[PDB]
């Protein structure tokens, strides 16, 4: 039955993404091959290849589910902060990015593996796809509330995403990441407090 | 002799890749531009990417010299004004269609992530840290962790160049980007 195989193939796709996220999150992309991931998912190499043409193609789908969870957790952390003004929402969002990007799995897959496997253009495209809307919305609300000078929203959003992604990559490869994270949080908080009217 | 061959090849490659991009010019065309045989070129450079590595170093050296000249010519009177002029200088130099082609489009792809990040950090981190350190010395910027602030500003400036380079409307993207970076610097100096 075609339907049976198609349901099992959809299940196989989920099992492979779950399996690869777990093993690559622990050991890194370079240290785990597709045969080990197929065994972990409990599926044949033939079923795996039917879903993902090669190792990089499975890695792209892992990045998507991780980035989905990163954005959901940033939104959850911002809501949990109880920020009462757009300026406080921005302060909470900056703190939320340093907390989420400090998760060892996000560090390994997004900050260390993804720039290498996706390349610069591919990494930029993913970061923008997931974060540009949230960032533009925070900026737009701050401007509407009179807490931020009216200025071009998309360019400010892109530049701030670049600053924050470079901050997280610096923390990811620091000799002392705990110190790097605390010092980065201080310079970002000073910069935001210099820019915001509130 | 070695150095002379290498100089001719780097000059030739920078000229032709600057014009047409890395993908559109092969090594045999560069060897002819330099006036050396393919044999002499392969003696000096393992492959196309290895020649490109050396071309990126001399292009990054030219970028730095052009930014330092533009900053000196600006008549910046204080470290804070030097920062503002350095940001304007980066937008001008990275808007050169040749710098766009070699550094913003070709280098990330040819060198890969790790290689490209190592080069861009080696050229950008030291000038940035020095600009911050002088502003703090002059009382124009709060004393705070210098390297972390330098990495944040380099992220902002790298993204600014990439956003302008790939924009539907680069002239508009450049005007708008210059305004948001001027507001960001005035915010940093106010923090
Ligand atoms: C593979 C691309 C990873 N970059 C990414 O997720 N960027 C990001 C997301 C939310 C918030 C911020 C500041 N940055
Ligand atoms: C994507 C741009 C990479 N930056 C680079 O390659 N060099 C550089 C030089 C001076 C200043 C800056 C910001 N960068």
TrEMBL record, chain B:
Alphabetized Pfam families for the sequence: TetR_C_41, TetR_N
Gene3D superfamilies to which the protein is assigned, alphabetical: Tetracycline Repressor, domain 2
Gene Ontology terms: biological process: regulation of DNA-templated transcription
Protein name: Probable transcriptional regulatory protein
Cellular component GO terms, alphabetical: plasma membrane
Species: Mycobacterium tuberculosis (strain ATCC 25618 / H37Rv)
Keyword set, alphabetical order: DNA-binding, Transcription, Transcription regulation
GO molecular function ontology, one term from the record: transcription cis-regulatory region binding
InterPro entries: Homeodomain-like_sf (IPR009057), HTH-type_TetR-like_transc_reg (IPR050109), HTH_TetR (IPR001647), Rv0078-like_C (IPR049484), Tet_transcr_reg_TetR-rel_C_sf (IPR036271)
Domain HTH tetR-type: 3-63
DNA-binding region: 26-45
Transferase as UniProt keyword: no
Highest rank taxon of the organism: Bacteria
């Amino acid at each position: 039955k075609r339907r049976t195989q198609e349901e099992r193939s959809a299940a196989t796709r989920e099992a492979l993404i779950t399996g690869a996220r777990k093993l690559w999150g622990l050991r890194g992309y370079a240290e785990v091959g597709t045969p080990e991931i197929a065994t972990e998912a409990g599926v044949t190499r033939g079923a795996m290849y039917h879903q993902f043409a090669d190792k990089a193609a499975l890695f792209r789908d892992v990045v998507e589910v991780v980035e989905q969870d990163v954005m959901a957790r940033m939104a959850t952390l911002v809501a949990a902060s109880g920020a009462a003004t757009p300026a406080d929402a921005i302060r909470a969002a900056v703190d939320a990015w340093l907390e989420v990007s400090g998760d060892p799995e996000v560090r390994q897959l997004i900050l260390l593996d993804a720039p290498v496997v996706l390349g610069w253009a591919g990494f930029r495209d993913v970061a923008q796809r997931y974060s540009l809307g949230m960032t533009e919305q925070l900026i737009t609300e701050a401007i509407r509330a009179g807490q931020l000078a009216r200025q071009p929203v998309r360019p400010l959003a892109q530049v701030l995403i670049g600053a924050l992604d470079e901050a997280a990559m610096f923390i990811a490869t620091a000799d002392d990441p705990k110190r790097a994270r605390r010092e980065t949080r201080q310079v970002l908080r000073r910069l935001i407090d210099g820019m915001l009217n509130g």
